[PDB]
Amino acid sequence: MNIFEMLRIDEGLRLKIYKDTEGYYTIGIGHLLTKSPSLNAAKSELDKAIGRNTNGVITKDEAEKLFNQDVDAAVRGILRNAKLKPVYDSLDAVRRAALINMVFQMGETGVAGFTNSLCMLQQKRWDEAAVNLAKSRWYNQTPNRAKRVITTFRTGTWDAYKNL
Numbered sequence: 001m002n003i004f005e006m007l008r009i010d011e012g013l014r015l016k017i018y019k020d021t022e023g024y025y026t027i028g029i030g031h032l033l034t035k036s037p038s039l040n041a042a043k044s045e046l047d048k049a050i051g052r053n054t055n056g057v058i059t060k061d062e063a064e065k066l067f068n069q070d071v072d073a074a075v076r077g078i079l080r081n082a083k084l085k086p087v088y089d090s091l092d093a094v095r096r097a098a099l100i101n102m103v104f105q106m107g108e109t110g111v112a113g114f115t116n117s118l119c120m121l122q123q124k125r126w127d128e129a130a131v132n133l134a135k136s137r138w139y140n141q142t143p144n145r146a147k148r149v150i151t152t153f154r155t156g157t158w159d160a161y162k163n164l
C-alpha cells in the first residue's frame, strides 16, 4: 500500500464524466472538474486538462496522468501551507498518506481548518485525534472513507485498506 493505491481505492476509476459524492462533475480517479452545474463547463475543463477534444470520455492512461498530477498537487499544497506543513513534517510516512488523502478530497484550505485535529496529530495523541476528526461534516457525509483515513491516523498502519 501507498498513497496512490489508497486514493485509488477511495476514489475509484471511471472513464466518463460522473458526479462525485457532493454532486460535482468529476472524471478518472477523483479528478474534480468543476463545481458548476453545467456539464458543458465540465467538458471544457476536461478538454483543457487533457489537451484534446474529449467529449467527456478519457482513457485509463489519461486518468492515471491526471491522478499523478493531483496527488503531486495535494503534496505541494501541504508543503506550502503554514498550518499543514509542520503537521506533515511531524508524521511518519503512513500517516502522511492519510493527510494527503484528506487534502485530495477537501483541498488545502479545508484541511487546514481542522485546527484542533491537526494539533492533536502533531502531539501524537492518536486516539484523541481520531475522536476529534470524526466530529466533522467530512465524517458525517463520507463515513466509510473517513473511518479508513482516521484508522490510518490512529494506528499508523494500512489495516483499513488491507482487505480492499
Ligand SMILES: *SC1=NC(C)(C)N(O)C1(C)C
Binding pocket: 118, 119, 120, 122, 123
Ligand atoms: S498545533 C499546536 N498547538 C499547541 C500550542 C498545543 N502546540 O504546541 C502545537 C502542536 C504547535
Ligand SMILES: [Cl-]
Binding pocket: 128, 131, 132, 135
Ligand atoms: Cl474532541
Ligand SMILES: [Cl-]
Binding pocket: 134, 135, 136, 137
Ligand atoms: Cl459534529
Ligand SMILES: [Cl-]
Binding pocket: 141, 142, 143, 144, 145, 146
Ligand atoms: Cl464514505
Ligand SMILES: [K+]
Binding pocket: 010, 011, 012, 020, 021, 026, 029, 030
Ligand atoms: K470518486
